[PDB]
Amino acid sequence: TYSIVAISGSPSRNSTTAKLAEYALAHVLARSDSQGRHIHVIDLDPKALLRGDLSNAKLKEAVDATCNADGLIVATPIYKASYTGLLKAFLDILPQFALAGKAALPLATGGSPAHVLALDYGLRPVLHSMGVRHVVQSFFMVQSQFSLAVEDDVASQLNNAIDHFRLSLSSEPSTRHLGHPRPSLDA
Amino acid sequence: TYSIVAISGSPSRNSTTAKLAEYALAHVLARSDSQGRHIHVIDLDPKALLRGDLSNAKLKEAVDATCNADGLIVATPIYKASYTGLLKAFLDILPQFALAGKAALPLATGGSPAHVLALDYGLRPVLHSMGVRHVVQSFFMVQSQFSLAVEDDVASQLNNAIDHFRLSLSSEPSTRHLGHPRPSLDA
Amino acid sequence: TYSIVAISGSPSRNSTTAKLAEYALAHVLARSDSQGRHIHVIDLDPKALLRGDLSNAKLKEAVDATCNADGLIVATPIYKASYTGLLKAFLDILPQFALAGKAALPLATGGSPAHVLALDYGLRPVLHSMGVRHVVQSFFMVQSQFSLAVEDDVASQLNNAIDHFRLSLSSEPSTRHLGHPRPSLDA
Amino acid sequence: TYSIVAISGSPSRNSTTAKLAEYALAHVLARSDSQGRHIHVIDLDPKALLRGDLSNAKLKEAVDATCNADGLIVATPIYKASYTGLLKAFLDILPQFALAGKAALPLATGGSPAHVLALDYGLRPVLHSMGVRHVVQSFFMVQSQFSLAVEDDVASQLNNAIDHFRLSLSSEPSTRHLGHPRPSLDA
């Protein structure tokens, strides 16, 4: 059974990005032998988050869940042409090679189609600094296009990305350290 | 008289990055008609910061000081091959075109020379999303090289960067909106 | 008197990107004491270009003109989410710190607004590897928007970028090495 | 049986980058049921390459071989903090979604460890613009470290990257369009 974890990073209440991540998580769980959880970074204790204080139980639990996942859905609104500081603050407290062995799906929403590349030029390299095994294609949605609630063209692309993410998940322990530059030195 | 603001973004106590930003701020003030301040992002209220709550006086003051600056020194340790979430969280609460008219100097420290490009590929585009007028060359220092406390080669490069930053400062009101895509629509 | 050089990098005949670069060059020359030239990379000898063979007079002349410029207009269509190989091939043959002292204006056209960031995440860091003094804001135009031939909103942004580029030009020899990490070691 | 294609993009004769790509290609072929070829971009006809002239047989053959590959090894020296114009010129002539279904391994050599990130921030996004299925970790080598001819630490990392690349290859036709945003619209 796979463990899928979504991480969504809008600091805004009523996040469209969170709804997109939730849609993706449900889509995957409906089609694979998986359980999941959704870490809303806004709901973590701000002081403990920024300080990396793992004596805070809920923060520690989020970090552990991320490290134990087979696949991560990583979702952010575009802020200042990149991922949010809130999301990055969470990523910052994971272990150096936290994503070894894991598949990943980058998702974003933005106000303008002009910032589609923020995922591939911005978030993708950060995931790769963490030894990630397989990051599939990024999907970006313009705020308006949202409202299974979007134009058919956009919906196909989204569903295809989530399909690929699900297909990329690994059920073999032989893959658990892949992506790490020195697998024997753990993951 | 110029207003220079340094912003340093390590979540760590006893920050080498903060010391580097402080050195740069002093260097500039010693050689120009300038006053300055140093915003240590770690010292802002974490909840108000992540929420963009400007009813918090100290946070509001930091934002106002940044908006009123003629030059910004923007300093971060390299975390996960990019700037810190803590720094980006601060940038996230500035107005859309907050940096219109302003000069800027990107500084970082890291554990490895392998991540020198995180400034130019990572931070530089974010500053440009904010209508920044002139971002001079980046300077990156490897943690060890630190201890006016470094190898002569490194010191020359650092001092040259800070020199250029100082020279790039503008004393003319005609430049106040430069960098903004629609100057008449403010800055 | 300033020397302005435009470099345009579409491998396609009848380049919209070339027309945009030509517009920008004319705009600058109409408003400053400047002379200019427009290097169309497609018109350089392909073998000599890819080999960096400076025994080819026309290639050598282009390189010399670039090195002697006070400002460069650097224009590319977006190919595969970045600048063209053709443009980069030209940049590759310039000296290591070829752009020391120089102002620069990044321009592009693309088929989709989705790749606006290719300039700031892609081309901007390359210019900074060359000791460039001041790169002003990027301007990107979607192919359709073209036809002083565009929507008023787009035209304002373009003209503002070119205005800023012109204003950023330096008439003082004291600036000739600025941007170089070791000015005394030339430029 | 897998088809593996290496593409190496140094414009320099006696390329260390080419030797690294050749090592990687041999490593993969020694451990999987694979045949391979090595496209040295410098050996393609410069005029036909820059013009995308597929009436040139050798260029057409290279493009076809790339499109027919199950895995690509993509190798470049670092020039001006990014991949070479020569390499990008080749990538530019591939079909829009040329890499659909394919695994990929990014390799580089450079003069300085300071540009390690050029692969992940520079080349990786370009491969993803082409619908690539799985790009494993990047490997970068400093020119000196070269001479199975390097320090044990570096050799382990290289071999691990090539191992992962080989393991990522797919023998199932069900994967042939994965990575493409609209699989039914081909690849």
Ligand SMILES: NC(=O)C1=CN([C@@H]2O[C@H](COP(=O)(O)OP(=O)(O)OC[C@H]3O[C@@H](n4cnc5c(N)ncnc54)[C@H](O)[C@@H]3O)[C@@H](O)[C@H]2O)C=CC1
């Ligand atoms: N080149 C292109 O493809 C096109 C882009 N656009 C963009 O689509 C936009 C319409 O969306 P919006 O109403 O703006 O919704 P939005 O989702 O972009 O903005 C939401 C809120 O966040 C604020 N905001 C946006 N960007 C910000 C920033 N960088 N920093 C701080 N706050 C920010 C806005 O003020 C707004 O209140 C147009 O305003 C235009 O910017 C529109 C047409 C074409």
Ligand SMILES: NC(=O)C1=CN([C@@H]2O[C@H](COP(=O)(O)OP(=O)(O)OC[C@H]3O[C@@H](n4cnc5c(N)ncnc54)[C@H](O)[C@@H]3O)[C@@H](O)[C@H]2O)C=CC1
């Ligand atoms: N290719 C290159 O140029 C070379 C790079 N290096 C690097 O220099 C390093 C020596 O510096 P360090 O002792 O590591 O000091 P450091 O300043 O890099 O690390 C400080 C602390 O942060 C932790 N840390 C580092 N990276 C982290 C990450 N991505 N996520 C979470 N925590 C992280 C470390 O565990 C350490 O406790 C070597 O370990 C090596 O990584 C060394 C030689 C050459």
Ligand SMILES: NC(=O)C1=CN([C@@H]2O[C@H](COP(=O)(O)OP(=O)(O)OC[C@H]3O[C@@H](n4cnc5c(N)ncnc54)[C@H](O)[C@@H]3O)[C@@H](O)[C@H]2O)C=CC1
């Ligand atoms: N998210 C967004 O903001 C939106 C993006 N679009 C894009 O605008 C496009 C309309 O422009 P086009 O007719 O395509 O003109 P174009 O200027 O994009 O393409 C020109 C030619 O180059 C080819 N081409 C395009 N991309 C290529 C690639 N990556 N590799 C190789 N060849 C390539 C095309 O086949 C075409 O023949 C739509 O097709 C869509 O892609 C449209 C609406 C919204």
Ligand SMILES: NC(=O)C1=CN([C@@H]2O[C@H](COP(=O)(O)OP(=O)(O)OC[C@H]3O[C@@H](n4cnc5c(N)ncnc54)[C@H](O)[C@@H]3O)[C@@H](O)[C@H]2O)C=CC1
């Ligand atoms: N921050 C860091 O980690 C450190 C970086 N380094 C770098 O390692 C270097 C030693 O290697 P090199 O002898 O330079 O061999 P190289 O492999 O870097 O250079 C090969 C040739 O290409 C030329 N070249 C290099 N960069 C160029 C550019 N951007 N444009 C045009 N031509 C270029 C050089 O002149 C040289 O002739 C030092 O010079 C230093 O730059 C050295 C120590 C530390």
Ligand SMILES: Cc1cc2nc3c(=O)[nH]c(=O)nc-3n(C[C@H](O)[C@H](O)[C@H](O)COP(=O)(O)O)c2cc1C
């Ligand atoms: C402070 C701030 C900065 C923003 N910066 C950008 C941006 O740079 N590019 C963009 O396309 N949208 C930008 N936006 C718009 C958001 O990305 C967009 O509204 C997004 O859908 C919000 O998602 P959410 O509902 O999950 O918070 C910004 C919004 C805010 C509040």
Ligand SMILES: Cc1cc2nc3c(=O)[nH]c(=O)nc-3n(C[C@H](O)[C@H](O)[C@H](O)COP(=O)(O)O)c2cc1C
């Ligand atoms: C969580 C974490 C992640 C780090 N990631 C990187 C990295 O990706 N690249 C790097 O060169 N150094 C990395 N480092 C090392 C720091 O950049 C380095 O120690 C820096 O000098 C710390 O600056 P400070 O004293 O101001 O906090 C990381 C350190 C930590 C704690």
Ligand SMILES: Cc1cc2nc3c(=O)[nH]c(=O)nc-3n(C[C@H](O)[C@H](O)[C@H](O)COP(=O)(O)O)c2cc1C
């Ligand atoms: C091979 C090729 C690749 C392209 N890749 C992109 C792309 O990645 N993103 C984009 O927006 N447009 C892309 N385009 C469309 C061109 O950027 C667009 O047509 C541009 O305006 C051409 O400019 P030109 O007339 O100067 O050649 C591509 C076009 C071609 C021929």
Ligand SMILES: Cc1cc2nc3c(=O)[nH]c(=O)nc-3n(C[C@H](O)[C@H](O)[C@H](O)COP(=O)(O)O)c2cc1C
């Ligand atoms: C024109 C030129 C530009 C270069 N730019 C860089 C650079 O930006 N960063 C770097 O680390 N090395 C740079 N180098 C050094 C090469 O990356 C290095 O020598 C590489 O190993 C050459 O590989 P090759 O033997 O396959 O040609 C450059 C070399 C040349 C000739």
